[PDB]
Amino acid sequence: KKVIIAGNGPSLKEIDYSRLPNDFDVFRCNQFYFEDKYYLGKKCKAVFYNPSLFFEQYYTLKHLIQNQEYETELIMCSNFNQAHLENENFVKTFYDYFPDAHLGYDFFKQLKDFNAYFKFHEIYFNQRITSGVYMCAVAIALGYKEIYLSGIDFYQSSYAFDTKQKNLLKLAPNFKYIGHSKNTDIKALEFLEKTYKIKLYCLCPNSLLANFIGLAPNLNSNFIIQEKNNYTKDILIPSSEAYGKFSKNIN
Amino acid sequence: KKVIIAGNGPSLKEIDYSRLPNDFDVFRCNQFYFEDKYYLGKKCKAVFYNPSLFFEQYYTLKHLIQNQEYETELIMCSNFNQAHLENENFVKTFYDYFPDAHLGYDFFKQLKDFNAYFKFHEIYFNQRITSGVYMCAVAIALGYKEIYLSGIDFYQSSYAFDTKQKNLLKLAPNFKYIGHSKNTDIKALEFLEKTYKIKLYCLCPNSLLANFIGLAPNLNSNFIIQEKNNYTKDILIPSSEAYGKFSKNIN
Amino acid sequence: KKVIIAGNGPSLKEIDYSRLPNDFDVFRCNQFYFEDKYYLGKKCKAVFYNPSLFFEQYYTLKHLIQNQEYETELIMCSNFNQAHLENENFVKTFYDYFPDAHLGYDFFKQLKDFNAYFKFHEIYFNQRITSGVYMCAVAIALGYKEIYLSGIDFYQSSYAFDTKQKNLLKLAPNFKYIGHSKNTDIKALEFLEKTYKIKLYCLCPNSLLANFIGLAPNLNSNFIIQEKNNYTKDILIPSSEAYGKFSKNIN
Amino acid sequence: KKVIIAGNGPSLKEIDYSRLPNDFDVFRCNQFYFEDKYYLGKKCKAVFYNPSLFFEQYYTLKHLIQNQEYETELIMCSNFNQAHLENENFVKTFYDYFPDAHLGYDFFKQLKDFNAYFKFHEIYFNQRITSGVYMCAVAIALGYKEIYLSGIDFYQSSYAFDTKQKNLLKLAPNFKYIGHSKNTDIKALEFLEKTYKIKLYCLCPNSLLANFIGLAPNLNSNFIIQEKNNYTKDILIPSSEAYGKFSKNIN
C-alpha cells in the first residue's frame, strides 16, 4: 500500500485531490483532529503524538474513536531514546500504561543510518527534524515504498486551524521549536529517499514543499471532503486521580 | 478442558450442581480457603492472590497443601505492572522469592486488547475490574474456551463466609474497593467474551450475575460436597525473621 | 560421567577408596585447598565459592592453578538471587569481573521444584542448606545422575583441616551458620533424589551421612593419595588497589 | 581478509612496505588522524576510541569523513564493562546516542579466555593492555586470522606525531598510563596468538616489537604514501549545547 503522511500546516487544506493515489493509508499527528473538515478522511493507519502530551492525547483519542470522529489502527509515541527529549520512566513503562500503543523508536531505530543522521544533527548542531519527517521514517521502517506528503510547510499562518484552544493553552501555554528549519527537514527527507530507495511525492503544488519534492502524478482521482460538525477541536484534560496515577511519567 | 472460576461471594454456596460441566479445572482466589465446605472440591488448577498479601498467602497455601486441605497446580499473583497497584521490587524479584509461582500479568498481558481496556478504565476513570474477572482473563490467555462462573455477586452479605478473622484483621484491618461496580465487571466480561470468542456461563441462577450471563446447561451432573472440619479458616502470619528478609518487597 | 561431591568435614579423610566409582568428576568448595593430602586428586570438574569471599577466593584459585596445585574446568559462585544472602551489584556485574566463572544460580534455578523448596525453607523458617547440598543441586542441573558424597558431616571436629589460618581469620574473624542442621541437609538431599530420579551414594561408612544415604558399592577400585608439600593452606589477600576496584561489589 | 592494526607510536612511520600483505583492512585508533602522511591509506575498516574522549572523537570523525580525509566502515568504543574504566550511563545509552557505532566489548567479550585474562591482570595486578592489543582482540573476535602490526612501540619519542595540540590539551591536559608496559602487551599478544590460533606479524623491523613478533614476509608489494595538506590535526570540541545534552554520560 501507499502512504499519505500529513503534517498540520496550512497546505493540509490545499491538497490537489486529483493527485491522490489509488490505494493508501493515512498517517496523522498531534493536533490533527483540530481540522474543520476531513481533509484526508476519518480513517487513519496510524496517529503519532509527542511524548510531552501523550497522556492527554491518548485520553483524547479514545474519545475521538468512541465518538466516531476518527479511527486508527496504530497509536505511536514519537520518541528517540534521548534523556533530553522524553521522560525516562514514561518510556520504560510505556507498554504497560498503553498496551495498544507503540513507541515510535521501536520502528525509527530500525533505520540505523537515519537514526545516526538524526542523532548527530540533534545532539551536536541542535538541528531537529519535525514530526512530519519522523512519520516518514517510521513509514519506511514499516515497509512503505511510496510516500505522499501534505501539510508540511516549514512554518512559513502556523496551522491549517486555530490551535489557540483553552485546554491546549492550559496544558502548553507556549501555543500563543527553534531547532526546526525547512533546510533540516528537506535535507532529512532527501537522505531518507536516497538511502532507502523510496519515493517521495508532494500533494500540495502551492506548498514550499513543492520547490523540493516532485508532485504526485495526476490520476483523475476523486475524493469527497466530508465536513465536520460539533466535533472535538480541543485536547481533553484527564482528572486529577488520573494524573496522580501517571505522575512518575510526566515530570 | 473447561474452567470454573470462583469469586468468594455468597453465591459460591448456591451453585446448581446439576449444571456442573463434565471435565473441569477450578480457579480460586484470595480467602477462598475460608469456605466451610468444599463447594468446588479440594483440587485447584490455579489459585490467585493479590500482591498486597502475597507473602502471607503463599506461606498459608504451603500449610494448606501440607495439611492436605487443598492442592493446586499453579500459583498466581494478580498484578498489572502498575506502580500505583503493586510494589516494584516485589514484581522484579518475584520468581526468585517464589520460584513455583507466576506473576499473573505474564498471562494477562497476552490479551492485548483487554490489557488496554483494563488500563484505560483504571488509569483514567478509576474503574477497576475485580479478581474474579482477572481470573477469567488469565484463563482465556491460558487457552480455556468455556468458562463457568460462580461466587461473583458484585458486592450486593459480603462473602460466602465470615472474613473477620483475627490474623486477617491484623494484616488488613480494613476487612471490618470503591472502583469496583457490577457494571465495570459486567462490561469487562462482555468485552472478553466478544473479543476472544469464548463462552461464559453462570452456575448460580440466583446471583445477580444471572441477569447478564446465561446459565450453564443442565447435564444431570452430580457432585459431592465434602464438609470441612478443624480446617484453616484464617490467614497465617510469618515470623519477624521472614518479614525482615522480605521487607524490600512489601513497603 | 559420575560425580563425587566433597564437603570439607572430617570424613573427607575417611573415604573408603575401594568404593570409588570408575569414571568420575570432582566437585570441591570453599577452603577445600586447606587439605593436607589430595584426598580426591588435583583435578576438579568444578570448584564452588560463597559470594562473601569470592573476590579473594578467585584470586587464590588463580594462584593454585598457576602453581600447579589444582586445576578445575568450572568456577562457580553459590548464589541464590536473594538480597539478604549476596550483594546485588556483585551478581549484576559478575560475568564482567569474572568472565571464566559462573553464577551457580544459573544452574540452581533450573531445578524449579528445588529452588522453591530451598526458598520456602530459607525465607520462612530460616532453614538453609549447606554448600555441599547446593553442589548436588548444581550437579543434577548439569545432568549428573549418580552422585557420590563425602566430607558432609553436619558439623557434628569442624573440618578435615585447621581453618584457623591468619589471612582467613583476618577476612572472616568468625572462623574461631545457625540455620544449618543435619535434618535440613538430609531432607533436602532426599528431596533431590526422589524429585529428580538420581542416585545418592555415600563414600564414608563412618560419617553420620551413612545413617541416611546407602554406601557406594565396593568395586575393588584403587586410588593413590598424593601427599602435599609446601602447599597453599591459607586464602590470599588482594592488594588495596584491587579492593578499590571491586568495592562496589562487596559492601 | 587480512588486517593491519596500527598503534600510533613512532614505528608507524617506519613500515617496511614491501612486507605489506595483498588484501587487507586497516584498524586505527585514537589520535591516528594527527599523522602527517597517510601511512596506511585513507580507508579504515574500523577506528577505535577510548570511552573518555568518545563524545569529542565521534564529532571529529564526522568532520574527517565529510571533509574526505578518511573513511571508515566501523566505529568502536574500547570499553570493558568495568565501572572504574568507563561511565555507566555512557555504556547503557551508547547505541541510542551513536547509532552507527559499536561498543567494542560486544566483540571483546566473545573471547572469553582473553576477557578473563585481561580482567584478572587489570583488577588484581593493575596490568592493563593498550588499545593496540585491544584492537587485536576485537579483530580475532571478528574472524581475522592474520594480523599485521605497526605503530606499537611500548612507549620506549611518544607518538609518530606531535600530540600537544591546543584542543586535545584543553580536553586532556595530561598529554604534556602507568599500568602499561611492554611485557604486559607482549604477554597478552602471545596469549591471543596461541589461544585463538591466529598469526601475528610485525611490519616494522626496527620496532622493539620485532624482538618478539616475527616479521611479515617480503612480497615485493608497493604502496603509495599520500601526503597530507591543510588537514585536521587536532581534536574538535563540541558546543556547550552539545555538552549539555550529553552530560549524564561523561562525569
Ligand SMILES: Nc1cc[n+]([C@@H]2O[C@H](COP(=O)(O)O)[C@@H](O)[C@H]2O)c(=O)[nH]1
Ligand atoms: N506551519 C507548519 C505546521 C506544522 N508542520 C508540520 O506538521 C507537523 C505537526 O505540527 P506540530 O507543530 O504539532 O509538530 C510538524 O511537526 C511539521 O512537520 C509544518 O510543516 N508547518
Ligand SMILES: Nc1cc[n+]([C@@H]2O[C@H](COP(=O)(O)O)[C@@H](O)[C@H]2O)c(=O)[nH]1
Ligand atoms: N460480595 C462479593 C465478594 C466477592 N466477589 C468476587 O470474588 C472475588 C474475591 O473476593 P475479594 O474481595 O477477595 O476480591 C472478588 O474480587 C469478586 O470478583 C463478588 O463478586 N462479590
Ligand SMILES: Nc1cc[n+]([C@@H]2O[C@H](COP(=O)(O)O)[C@@H](O)[C@H]2O)c(=O)[nH]1
Ligand atoms: N563439619 C562439617 C564441615 C563442612 N561440611 C560440609 O562441607 C561444606 C564446606 O564447608 P563450609 O563450612 O565452608 O561450608 C559445608 O557447606 C557442608 O556441606 C559438613 O558437612 N560438616
Ligand SMILES: Nc1cc[n+]([C@@H]2O[C@H](COP(=O)(O)O)[C@@H](O)[C@H]2O)c(=O)[nH]1
Ligand atoms: N609510544 C607509543 C605510542 C602508542 N602506542 C600504541 O598505539 C596505541 C595508541 O596510542 P595511545 O596513547 O592513544 O593509546 C597505544 O594504545 C599503544 O598500543 C605504542 O605502542 N607506543
